[PDB]
Design an enzyme around this catalytic site. Structure first.
Site, PDB file in Angstrom:
ATOM      1  CG  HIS A  84     -32.897 -49.916 -17.710  1.00 22.22           C
ATOM      2  ND1 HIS A  84     -33.278 -50.175 -16.472  1.00 22.22           N
ATOM      3  CD2 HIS A  84     -32.997 -48.511 -17.921  1.00 22.22           C
ATOM      4  CE1 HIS A  84     -33.337 -49.070 -15.802  1.00 22.22           C
ATOM      5  NE2 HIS A  84     -33.372 -47.964 -16.636  1.00 22.22           N
ATOM      6  CG  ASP A  88     -31.263 -45.815 -12.918  1.00 18.01           C
ATOM      7  OD1 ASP A  88     -31.278 -45.480 -14.047  1.00 18.01           O
ATOM      8  OD2 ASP A  88     -32.424 -46.096 -12.297  1.00 18.01           O
ATOM      9  CG  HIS A 149     -37.864 -47.770 -16.904  1.00 17.19           C
ATOM     10  ND1 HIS A 149     -38.165 -46.495 -16.380  1.00 17.19           N
ATOM     11  CD2 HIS A 149     -36.723 -47.724 -17.105  1.00 17.19           C
ATOM     12  CE1 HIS A 149     -37.274 -45.874 -16.227  1.00 17.19           C
ATOM     13  NE2 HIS A 149     -36.260 -46.431 -16.647  1.00 17.19           N
TER      14      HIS A 149
HETATM   15  C1  LIG Z   1     -31.027 -42.105 -14.771  1.00 13.65           C
HETATM   16  C2  LIG Z   1     -32.674 -42.303 -14.909  1.00 13.65           C
HETATM   17  C3  LIG Z   1     -32.935 -41.806 -16.435  1.00 13.65           C
HETATM   18  C4  LIG Z   1     -32.041 -41.229 -17.071  1.00 13.65           C
HETATM   19  C5  LIG Z   1     -31.957 -40.895 -18.629  1.00 13.65           C
HETATM   20  C6  LIG Z   1     -33.467 -41.167 -18.993  1.00 13.65           C
HETATM   21  N1  LIG Z   1     -34.385 -41.852 -18.277  1.00 13.65           N
HETATM   22  C7  LIG Z   1     -34.272 -42.198 -16.800  1.00 13.65           C
HETATM   23  O1  LIG Z   1     -34.857 -42.811 -16.103  1.00 13.65           O
HETATM   24  C8  LIG Z   1     -33.274 -41.434 -13.867  1.00 13.65           C
HETATM   25  C9  LIG Z   1     -32.914 -40.151 -13.600  1.00 13.65           C
HETATM   26  C10 LIG Z   1     -33.699 -39.322 -12.702  1.00 13.65           C
HETATM   27  C11 LIG Z   1     -34.728 -40.004 -12.270  1.00 13.65           C
HETATM   28  C12 LIG Z   1     -35.326 -41.089 -12.336  1.00 13.65           C
HETATM   29  C13 LIG Z   1     -36.594 -41.833 -12.178  1.00 13.65           C
HETATM   30  C14 LIG Z   1     -37.521 -41.846 -11.181  1.00 13.65           C
HETATM   31  C15 LIG Z   1     -38.012 -40.505 -11.152  1.00 13.65           C
HETATM   32  C16 LIG Z   1     -39.132 -40.221 -10.304  1.00 13.65           C
HETATM   33  C17 LIG Z   1     -39.540 -41.295  -9.314  1.00 13.65           C
HETATM   34  C18 LIG Z   1     -40.595 -41.084  -8.385  1.00 13.65           C
HETATM   35  S1  LIG Z   1     -42.340 -41.665  -8.924  1.00 13.65           S
HETATM   36  C19 LIG Z   1     -42.129 -43.309  -9.300  1.00 13.65           C
HETATM   37  O2  LIG Z   1     -43.129 -41.208  -7.862  1.00 13.65           O
HETATM   38  O3  LIG Z   1     -42.560 -40.862 -10.035  1.00 13.65           O
HETATM   39  C20 LIG Z   1     -38.887 -42.478  -9.533  1.00 13.65           C
HETATM   40  F1  LIG Z   1     -39.266 -43.649  -8.742  1.00 13.65           F
HETATM   41  C21 LIG Z   1     -37.760 -42.807 -10.410  1.00 13.65           C
HETATM   42  C22 LIG Z   1     -36.268 -43.136 -12.933  1.00 13.65           C
HETATM   43  C23 LIG Z   1     -37.122 -44.549 -13.231  1.00 13.65           C
HETATM   44  O4  LIG Z   1     -38.411 -44.356 -13.300  1.00 13.65           O
HETATM   45  O5  LIG Z   1     -36.595 -45.587 -13.351  1.00 13.65           O
HETATM   46  N2  LIG Z   1     -35.034 -43.152 -13.663  1.00 13.65           N
HETATM   47  C24 LIG Z   1     -34.638 -41.859 -13.678  1.00 13.65           C
HETATM   48 ZN   LIG Z   2     -34.695 -46.134 -13.119  1.00 12.09          ZN
HETATM   49 ZN   LIG Z   3     -34.000 -46.298 -16.397  1.00 15.90          ZN
END
Ligand SMILES: C[C@H](c1ccc[nH]c1=O)c1cccc2c(-c3ccc(CS(C)(=O)=O)c(F)c3)c(C(=O)O)[nH]c12
Ligand SMILES: [Zn+2]
Ligand SMILES: [Zn+2]
Length: 231
Positions: A84, A88, A149
């Site tokens: 996507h 990341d 997501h």
């Molecule tokens: C780069 C990306 C991003 C950028 C801009 C808009 N949107 C986005 O996603 C991003 C930046 C910083 C964090 C994330 C988490 C994430 C957060 C917390 C947990 C632990 S948990 C399940 O216990 O909440 C996790 F596993 C993933 C995820 C995800 O969810 O893919 N992407 C993240």
């Molecule tokens: Zn992610």
């Molecule tokens: Zn993402």
């Protein structure tokens, strides 16, 4: 000593983890909005070459990923797919492309990356615009389960190994919260997970976008955390 965790990886190095014959995950860490997170990608043997799934979340991390693959595996990374448009998944595509890796993503991912100012994979993957769609790409099948997501998220199956790479549409078992849902479709995410479950009932390993691999339980678990979030 098992799957590498966030506090075990300094930002800037990359670890590889053997999943199955011809299949590895890659793990790196990055800071974002003042917190540090791990993230996964995949490497799949493709003849005497390698297919990469997702960057290592950043330019430096992705350069380190290429160096780690060369040291440990020693076969050329010829193509990469980003699952996507978030950093990341595509952050590091410029490094890949400069290194001669042909980079691919769905047209949706490309449009969303362009609009957001994220790095843009070169080549469009057609045939994935309707939920339930699947195409072959080297040693994997790419599947569009529907919006989850993100609206563009793809999952990846390695049929030779029954490995399901869910990407960020799938969460690890230790999660109780639903991650970064800024771009999520919470109304569609459960339906999209149900499509994954229906399409890949024989998966033996399920790899989330962030955190530890497990078995099929990660799918229902993800639907549950999405419900917990919604409410
Ligand atoms: C780069 C990306 C991003 C950028 C801009 C808009 N949107 C986005 O996603 C991003 C930046 C910083 C964090 C994330 C988490 C994430 C957060 C917390 C947990 C632990 S948990 C399940 O216990 O909440 C996790 F596993 C993933 C995820 C995800 O969810 O893919 N992407 C993240
Ligand atoms: Zn992610
Ligand atoms: Zn993402």
């Amino acid at each position: 000593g098992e799957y590498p965790t966030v506090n075990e990886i300094p930002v800037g190095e990359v670890r590889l983890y053997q999943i199955a014959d011809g299949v590895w995950s890659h793990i790196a860490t990055q800071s974002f909005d003042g917190a540090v997170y791990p993230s996964n990608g995949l490497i799949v043997r493709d003849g005497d070459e390698l297919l990469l799934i997702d960057t290592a979340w950043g330019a430096k991390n992705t350069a380190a990923l290429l160096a780690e693959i060369e040291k440990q595996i020693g076969l050329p990374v010829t193509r990469a797919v980003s699952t996507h448009f978030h950093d990341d998944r595509v952050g590091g595509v410029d490094v890949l492309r400069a290194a001669g890796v042909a980079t691919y993503a769905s047209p949706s991912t490309r449009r969303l990356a362009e609009a957001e100012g994220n790095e843009i994979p070169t080549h469009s993957l057609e045939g994935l615009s309707s939920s339930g769609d699947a195409v072959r790409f080297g040693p994997v099948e790419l599947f569009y389960p529907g919006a989850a997501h993100s609206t563009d998220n793809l999952v990846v199956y390695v049929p030779s190994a029954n490995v399901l790479y869910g990407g960020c549409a799938v969460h690890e078992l230790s999660s109780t919260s639903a991650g970064n849902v800024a771009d999520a479709d919470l109304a569609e995410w459960p339906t999209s997970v149900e499509r994954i479950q229906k399409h890949y009932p024989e998966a033996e390993v399920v790899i989330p976008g962030h955190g530890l691999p497990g078995g099929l339980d990660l799918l229902q678990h993800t639907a549950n955390v999405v419900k917990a979030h919604k409410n």
